[PDB]
C-alpha cells in the first residue's frame, strides 16, 4: 500500500511538488479510514488534530453560520480537508459528512506540522 499511496500522492496538485523522501515519510505515517454515505467525518465545534485527503468518494460540507447548517460545498477524490483545526485554534469550523462510500488518508498533527504545514497551498488556503 506504500507504493499505492505514493502514486496517489504524486497525482494530487498540492503534493506533487514535494521531494520524494517527504512523500515517502507521509505514505508511512498516514492511516486509511473508511466511511459510509451519511456518516459524520467531522462535526463543527469539536476540537481536532487530524488532516484528511480523499482517496475515494465525495463528501458534503455544511456549517452553522452566525445568522440551521448551510450547505457549503462538495469535495471529491484528490481534495483535502481538516486544515483549519491545525492552524491557530484547534476547533473544527464546519461539518464534513460522507456522501457515499469514502476513503480518507489521515495524518495527525505531529506529522502535519513537520511535513505539510509550511505548504503555501494549504496554509494560504482561502474559501
Ligand atoms: N470553515 C469552512 N471549512 C471548509 C469550507 N470548505 C471545505 N472546508 C473544510 O471543512 C473542514 C472542517 O474541519 P476544519 O475546520 O479543520 O477544516 C475545514 C476545511 O478543510 C468552507 O467554505 N468553510
Ligand atoms: Na484554527
Molecular structure report:
With 127 residues, this protein is α+β, with helices and mostly antiparallel strands. The chain has a single domain, classed as Jelly Rolls (Sandwich), CATH 2.60.120.10. Helices cover 23% and strands 32% of the residues. It has four helices and eight strands; from the N terminus they run ααββββββββαα. It has helices at 2-9, 20-29, 109-115, 120-123; strands at 31-35, 40-42, 50-56, 58-63, 70-76, 80-81, 95-98, 102-108. Strands 1-8-3-6 form a four-stranded antiparallel beta sheet. A four-stranded antiparallel beta sheet has the order 2-7-4-5, with no helix packed on it. A hairpin with a 6-residue loop joins β4 and β5 (70-76). The longest helix has 10 residues, at 20-29. It is globular and about 45 Å long. The N and C termini lie far apart (32 Å). 3',5'-cyclic GMP 2 binds at residues 73, 82-85, 92-93, 127.
Which class best fits the helix and strand makeup? alpha+beta
- The third-level CATH topology is Jelly Rolls
Instruction: Categorize the overall geometry.
Output: globular
Task: Tell me how many strands there are.
Answer: 8
Largest sheet: 4 strands, antiparallel
CATH architectural category: Sandwich
Distance separating the two termini? 32 Å
Q: In percent, how much strand structure appears in the residues?
A: 25-35%
